[PDB]
Paper text:
Although a classical G protein β subunit was not found for Gpa1 in [name], Palmer and co-workers reported that a Gpa1-interacting protein, [name], could function as an atypical G protein β subunit13. Hence, [name], a scaffold protein interconnecting various cellular processes through binding a myriad of proteins, could also bind with the ribosome and function in ribosomal biogenesis and protein translation. Apparently, although not essential, [name] is important for growth at the mammalian body temperature and is required for full virulence.
We determined the crystal structure of [name] at 2.2-Å resolution by molecular replacement using Asc1 (PDB ID: 3FRX29) as a search model. The asymmetric unit contained one copy of [name]. The electron-density map is well defined apart from the first and last residue, as well as a short stretch of side chains between residues Gly276 and Arg282 in the extended loop linking blades six and seven. the structure features the predicted seven β-propeller fold, with an overall shape that resembles a donut of approximate dimensions 45 Å and 10 Å of the outer and inner circle, respectively, and 30 Å in width. Moreover, all of the seven β-propeller blades are arranged radially around the central axis and comprise four twisted antiparallel β-sheets labelled A, B, C, and D, starting from the inside. The interactions stabilising the β-propeller fold are conserved in blades one to five. The network of inter-blade hydrogen bonds between conserved residues observed in blades one to five is absent in blades six and seven. Deviation from the conserved structural motif in blades six and seven might be necessary to accommodate the extended loop located between these two blades or possibly provide a more dynamic binding site for protein partners. Although the middle portion of the loop seems to have a different conformation in [name] and Asc1, the knob-like structure in Asc1 consisting of stacked Pro276, Phe278, and Pro28729 is also observed in the [name] structure (consisting of Pro272, Phe274, and Pro284, respectively). Although Arg57, Lys62, Lys87, and Arg102 (Asc1 numbering) are not fully conserved, they are mostly replaced by other positively charged residues in RACK1 orthologues. Based on sequence and structural similarity to mammalian RACK1 and yeast Asc1 discussed above, we propose that [name]’s positively charged and surface accessible residues Arg36, Lys38, Lys57, His60, His85, Arg88, and Arg100 contribute to the interactions with rRNA.
Author numbering: 2 to 314
Write the structure that this text describes.
Amino acid sequence: AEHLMFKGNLAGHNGWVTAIATSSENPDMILTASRDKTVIAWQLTREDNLYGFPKKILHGHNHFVSDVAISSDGQFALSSSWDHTLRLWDLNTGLTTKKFVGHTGDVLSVSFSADNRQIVSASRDRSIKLWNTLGECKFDIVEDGHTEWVSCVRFSPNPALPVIISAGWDKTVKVWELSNCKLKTTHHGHTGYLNTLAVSPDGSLAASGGKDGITMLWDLNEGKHLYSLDAGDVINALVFSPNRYWLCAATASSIKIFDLESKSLVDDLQPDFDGLSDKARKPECTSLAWSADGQTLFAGFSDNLVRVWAVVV
């Protein structure tokens, strides 16, 4: 029987866990970003009492950390912050090697290209910027750009159509051709602002989500909308499983796991909140990541914890 099985918590942050990153290079490590202004590198022990412990606490941002990524070689962390900057960290030394300065508003998203030669980020300043790995901004994508905050930006891993995808508070999803940085497609359809966006491991699908409870799937090869899945509530985070045809949506109320083959619901994760139900709103899941091999789901929450589920059968 295959299904997510609660395995434990990672405790250590002192603010909402806002992003989680994972890599094949070290499967025993997790990176988490937080409103406590730190990134933590966790060592996973997978023991029953502690699933893991914080191994390194990366200090330096002056405001909420909003997103984090790991280099393909697993040795560098890349994070964005409401303090207007990105930072590249050496995970061996735990120090920042490069600061990316240039945005003029809160940075809400950051990501590595497949080959790690390019870095892309999105900000409240309504721009998308491309950097190199030395911290130099190489292009400012504004033309025909979003007219509100840009909340999430990602690369397509499809070698044939090199694009970046962005979602914004203008309720649209935009596809940009990477070669010249010109707008390729604007997708309309969402009725509310968007928090998040994820791309298929084969780069055929993009999923977008936000204030309307609806996650919409867009065909990156062809023109347009494919279908929509109704999550129950405001969508905080979206991620595709790397090794199953599944799409997970973290909402205010729950974590829904959608089977894409059937459009059916695989699971609805609602953790037992170790506290109470007295004049208190159940903590929201604010971030999601799969392990590289797709056997472990990590979920960050507004009660400062990471919660871990292990695919069982």
